[PDB]
Amino acid sequence: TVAYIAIGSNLASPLEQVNAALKALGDIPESHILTVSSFYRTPPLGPQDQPDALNAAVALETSLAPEELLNHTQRIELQQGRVRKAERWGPRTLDLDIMLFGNEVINTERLTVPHYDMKNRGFMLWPLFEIAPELVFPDGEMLRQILHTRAFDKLNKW
């Protein structure tokens, strides 16, 4: 299966956090990285004074079950960051979100795939399009056709 994972960081030098996360992602069992998008800069969306975020997407080949992949991405977040309660509302060292798990639809307490809001997030869609321009969502919509609406500015590189 190919899983598409969103990576975001806006704390403790985001490029360091993202490159460190890539190394950890490459160490997930029964899996390996196929490709990684360019790195995109996303200004804060709103009034809060937070650092710019670095956003990217990774295509990971894996024979793990979706829940097993999530185990590993959560583990990486917990191990790499100086994890804080306050990261839920402020700057955050690392966020690894499973955007897509192959063509599968998962609706469970722990795990919802496709990511519930990704179709509203240019900082997810644009890096995904860079690595998977031919992608079609489980609901049959083409990624290219979503972006061709021009509803999402193509983000600047990091």
Ligand X SMILES: Nc1ncnc2c1ncn2[C@@H]1O[C@H](COP(=O)(O)CP(=O)(O)OP(=O)(O)O)[C@@H](O)[C@H]1O
Does residue 41 carry a catalytic annotation?
Answer: no
User: Which is the catalytic residue, given 49, 52, 75, 95?
Assistant: 95
What angle is formed at CA 74 by the lines to CA 125 and CA 21, rounded to 5 degrees?
Answer: 65
Residue of 49, 82, 139, 150 marked catalytic: 82
Least distance between Cl ion and beta carbon 55 (Å) = 20
Question: 112 is in the binding site of which of Cl ion, Mg ion, ligand X, none (Cβ under 5 to 8 A by kind)?
Answer: ligand X
> Of ligand X, Cl ion, Mg ion, none, which one sits near residue 138, judging by CB under 5 to 8 A according to partner kind?
Cl ion
Q: Does 16 bind ligand X (CB under 6 A)?
A: no
**How far apart (Å, rounded) are the C-alpha atoms in residues 148 and 129?**
11
Q: Does 77 bind Mg ion (CB under 5 A)?
A: no
Is 82 a known active-site residue?
yes
- Closest approach, Cβ 153 to Cl ion, in A, equals 22
In the 3-class helix/strand/coil scheme, how is the chain assigned residue by residue?
CEEEEEEEECCCCHHHHHHHHHHHHCCCCCEEEEEECCCEEECCCCCCCCCCEEEEEEEEEECCCHHHHHHHHHHHHHHHCCCCHHHHCCCCCCEEEEEEECCCCEECCCCEECCCCHHHCHHHHHHHHHHCCCCECCCCCEHHHHHHCCCCCCCCEC
Active site includes 97?
yes
Q: Which of residues 113-142 bind Cl ion (CB under 5 A)?
A: 114, 137-139
Q: Does 95 bind ligand X (CB under 6 A)?
A: yes
Is 49 a residue of the active site?
no
Stretch touching Mg ion by CB under 5 A, among 18-26, 33-41, 96-104, 142-150: 96-104
Token pair recorded at residue 135: 């992608």
Residues found near ligand X in the complex (CB under 6 A):
95, 97-98, 110-113, 115, 117
